[PDB]
Amino acid sequence: MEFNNTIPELVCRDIDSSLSFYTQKLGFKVLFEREEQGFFFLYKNDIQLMLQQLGETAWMSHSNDTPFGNGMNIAFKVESLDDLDCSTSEDIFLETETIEYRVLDGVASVNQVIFRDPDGYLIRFVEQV
């Protein structure tokens, strides 16, 4: 199989809850799993994302009681936000908005939404317009 050049791996306090969030709310599918390690490799179109149940094999930068994901957001580029459940929700960190960003070679106009997953990871979907 082909691995994307950038794949986030999210340790999940409750992998069942996280799996339901990513599959049912965000439309990811399970590509493969190592279920005996609580590990799931998810995909949606061209994006990939790994989930890992919190446990002894997890790579934890801070203590287990430290809330997850602070400071970061993952920007996923999508052709459209239509297949996302952006109902406006405790799952929504930033409601759908159109924003102009000044970038290297001009202005990137985007439609974007940010979700906050069950452990606090921020997942930003960006549609370039």
Ligand X SMILES: C[C@H](c1c[nH]c2ccccc12)[C@@H]1OC(N)=NC1=O
Interface contacts to a second copy, rule CB under 8 A: 1, 3-12, 31-32, 34, 41, 46-48, 50, 54, 58-63, 66-77, 93-94, 102-105, 108, 114, 116, 119-122, 124, 126, 128
Going residue by residue from 16 to 35, which x/- string records binding to ligand X, judged by CB under 6 A? --------------------
- Whether the CB-CB separation of 25 and 125 falls below 8 Å is answered with no
Q: Which helix (H) or strand (E) covers residue 17, if one does?
A: helix 15-20
- Tell me whether residue 86 or residue 126 sits nearer to ligand X (CB atom): 126
Closest among 71, 37, 65, 61 to 51, alpha carbons compared: 37
State how far the Cα of 8 lies from the Cα of 18, in Å rounded to an integer: 14
State how far the Cα of 88 lies from the Cα of 37, in Å rounded to an integer: 35
From the list ligand X, a second copy, none, which binds 122 (C-beta under 5 to 8 Å, kind-based)?
A: a second copy
Going residue by residue from 99 to 128, which x/- string records binding to ligand X, judged by CB under 6 A? --x-x----x-x---------------x-x
Options 30, 31, 47, 50; binder of ligand X; rule CB under 6 A:
50
Question: To the nearest whole angstrom, how small is the minimum distance from the Cβ of residue 86 to a second copy?
Answer: 16
State how far the Cα of 37 lies from the Cα of 114, in Å rounded to an integer: 29
Question: Which distant-in-sequence residues (6+ apart) come within 8 Å of 94 by Cβ?
Answer: 112, 113, 114, 124
Contact residues toward ligand X (CB under 6 A) are 3, 7, 9, 41, 50, 75, 77, 101, 103, 108, 110, 126, 128
